């Protein structure tokens, strides 16, 4: 139920016009920025995580 | 009487101890499982969503 709903919501393909084109500097910086601003319902951005 | 420090004592008692939870009908063995009890205010048993 809800868990799936949550995960699916955060893991969804999108046009992603708002948050596209960001190098994550790794999962940590990506997380910061994601909570921050410009990222909503995920984004089409490449992440640096090892 | 419920005199204070009885509570903290009860906390000391259940430490590391586990209780069995069961729901009828018990169709398979997972109808009964063991959990570590966390004392809570209120009259309801709180169950973990994954089980």
């Amino acid at each position: 139920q809800d868990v799936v709903l949550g995960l699916y919501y955060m893991t969804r393909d999108c046009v992603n016009a708002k948050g596209e084109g960001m190098v994550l500097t790794g999962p940590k910086e990506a997380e910061r920025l994601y909570r921050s601003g410009l990222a909503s319902l995920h984004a089409r951005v490449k992440v640096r995580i090892t | 009487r419920e005199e204070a420090v009885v509570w903290d004592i009860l906390d000391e008692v259940i430490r590391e101890h586990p209780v069995l939870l069961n729901r009828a009908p018990t169709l398979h063995r997972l109808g009964i499982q063991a959990f570590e009890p966390v004392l809570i205010e209120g009259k309801a048993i709180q169950l973990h969503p994954l089980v």
């Binding site: 910086e29 910061r32 921050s36 | -």
Partner: protein, 287 residues
């Protein structure tokens, strides 16, 4: 008219630069309140130095890749983002990095500037493949606040805040009678330029400094529901209120013409049932 403030502290050092401090017994709802206030200060109002620009010789656009360097320019800028630097008293310093040879070009190879302190000298910035390969670059380090991407207006994503990640949990606190108290557990992931505790005390200091400018006796005997007889007898003795009754003593009441021990017993029972008795002094009857 108080509130439960500072009580019992715990510190879980997950590592040399990652800790978990816990402030215990904060009144319910204060978990998210302090959690969000602090999470908001930490994620944007912390003071830290960060790489904002880089000038590498021979390189023009981020699409370039370098002759004699393992990783492409993008990966190099990506490495430069993680350059942890602590500068004395300036809002901009130029670091020069000249390196020829084979192997990793770390932050320790950066030209030693007197003001500039390099937190992690073993921080790899590059990897020169051949022994005739060499890099010469000017890394710009500026002081600022929060995460300011390169897209803002070579340029490199600025992570001015010294803190990488914030997390919080509300968890029910123990604490004596009150029971519905919580404890805010803040998970911090800093870069070691700044200590966790001082980052917290600086966030708190910024917040507080932002708030610096806003800193039964008169009831009738009938309410006792005595027997009709007892009530009438008491009224006959000019005892019309509870206050009048509680002043009389057993001896005195038994001396009055119409009340007996059955009745007196009744009066003591009904009075005792309400926390009252006979022979009560109120010393000041009345005002």
């Amino acid at each position: 008219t108080e509130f439960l403030k500072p009580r019992l502290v715990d510190i879980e050092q997950v590592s040399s630069t990652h800790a978990k401090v816990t402030l215990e017994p904060l009144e319910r709802g204060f978990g998210h309140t302090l959690g969000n206030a602090l999470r908001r200060i930490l994620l944007s109002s912390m003071p830290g130095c960060a790489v904002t620009e880089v000038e590498i010789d021979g390189v023009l656009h981020e699409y370039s890749t370098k002759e004699g360097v393992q990783e492409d320019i993008l990966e190099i800028l990506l490495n430069l983002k993680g350059l942890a630097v602590r500068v004395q008293g300036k809002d901009e310093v130029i670091l020069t990095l000249n390196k020829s040879g084979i192997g990793p070009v770390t932050a320790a190879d950066i030209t030693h500037d007197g003001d500039v302190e390099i937190v992690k000298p073993q921080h790899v910035i590059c990897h020169l493949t051949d022994e005739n390969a060499s890099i010469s670059m000017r890394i710009k380090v500026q002081r600022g606040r929060g995460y300011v991407p390169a897209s803002t207006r070579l340029l490199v994503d600025a992570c001015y805040s010294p803190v990488e990640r914030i997390a919080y949990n509300v968890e029910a606190a123990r604490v004596e009678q009150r029971t519905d108290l919580d404890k805010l557990v803040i998970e911090m992931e800093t870069n070691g330029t700044i200590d966790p505790e001082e980052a917290i005390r600086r966030a708190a200091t910024i917040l507080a400094e932002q708030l610096e400018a806003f800193v039964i006796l008169l009831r009738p005997v009938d309410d006792l529901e005595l027997t009709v007889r007892s009530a009438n007898c008491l009224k006959a003795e000019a005892i019309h209120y509870i206050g009048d009754l509680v002043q009389r003593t057993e001896v005195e009441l038994l001396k009055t013409p119409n009340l007996g021990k059955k009745s007196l017993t009744e009066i003591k029972d009904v009075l005792a049932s309400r926390g009252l008795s006979l022979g009560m002094r109120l010393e000041n009857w009345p005002p």
